[PDB]
Amino acid sequence: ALEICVKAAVGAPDHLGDCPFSQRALLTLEEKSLTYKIHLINLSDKPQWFLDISPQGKVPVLKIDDKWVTDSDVIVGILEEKYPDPPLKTPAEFASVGSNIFGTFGTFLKSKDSNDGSEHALLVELEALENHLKSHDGPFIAGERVSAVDLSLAPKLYHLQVALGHFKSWSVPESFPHVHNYMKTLFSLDSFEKTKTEEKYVISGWAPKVNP
């Protein structure tokens, strides 16, 4: 069968954890309506069988054919080639929409210096997603149907909402109504609902990382 290893929740290794790249792969398995086993991996106490098949011990990892494959980009493109219907290819022109939101969200989340410009850098990336969404037909980045870019982005936007909300009482401003609407569209996908990390465990996941 297809099998996939993903991060288990910090403080709760019997529940699904908060890895956005793992969630991207789960989302793709679901949107293809494929059958798979999940192995929840405790990253602080990593079983031996798992290391024999993932050298660096990183997740996500997908077993396809009799090969264990890392790298969420690779994983989702192998799935697209092997199971072409329903297709999830995003037109190349839009495949990078939103690509810097996750990075600028992380930097802003971590900041304790109100003047380092990190907020503004995030706002500029949201702004750019807003400009795409308002000028192109939706509900998804490439129109009527969900595609690869939406599945890469959904877990990252969830993290942003949940983490900035919890840690900073901060929300995407009201002045990005397309971004809010797009986030609602993504979080009410059946695939998203089925694969989402409980909010608890996005918080437990981020808590040790907000301050070095």
Resolution value in angstroms: 2.3
Select from 88, 107, 131 the last residue of a domain.
88
74 with 96, same domain: the answer is no
20 with 97, same domain: the answer is no
Lookup: tokens for 95: 């495949």
Contact call for residues 205 and 18 (beta carbons, < 8 A): yes
5 with 83, same domain: the answer is yes
The structure was resolved experimentally with X-ray
**Cα dist. 163→21, 83, 85, 136, 204 in Å?**
16, 34, 34, 28, 10
Residue 159 labeled ligand binder: yes
Amino acid at 20: P
Lookup: tokens for 103: 């990075």
Is the Cα dihedral 88, 141, 94, 22 positive or negative? negative
76 with 147, same domain: the answer is no
Amino acid at 68: W
Residue 59 labeled ligand binder: yes
**Cα dist. 83→62, 64, 171 in Å?**
15, 12, 37
Q: After which residues is the chain broken (C to N over 2.5 A)?
A: none
CATH no. for residue 171? 1.20.1050.10
**Cα dist. 132→102, 118, 142 in Å?**
17, 22, 10
Contact call for residues 140 and 146 (beta carbons, < 8 A): yes
Select from 45, 60, 88 the last residue of a domain.
88
Residue-range definition of the domain harbouring residue 102: 89-212
Number of domains in the chain: 2
Helix (H, G, I), strand (E, B), or coil: what is residue 177?
Answer: helix
Binning the chain into helix, strand and coil, the percentages to the nearest 5 are 50, 15, 35
Lookup: tokens for 146: 């969900």
Instruction: Classify each residue of 14-38 as buried b or exposed e, where b means 16 or more C-beta atoms within 10 Å of its C-beta.
Output: eebbbbbbbbbbbbbbbbbeeebee
Instruction: Classify each residue of 134-154 as buried b or exposed e, where b means 16 or more C-beta atoms within 10 Å of its C-beta.
Output: eeeeeebbbeeebbbbbbbbb
Lookup: tokens for 167: 């840690």
Comparing C-alpha atoms, which of 53, 57, 62 is closest to residue 5? Answer: 62
Residue 206 labeled ligand binder: yes
Dihedrals phi, psi of 131, to nearest 5 degrees: -70, -35
Report, as residue numbers or ranges, the catalytic residues.
19
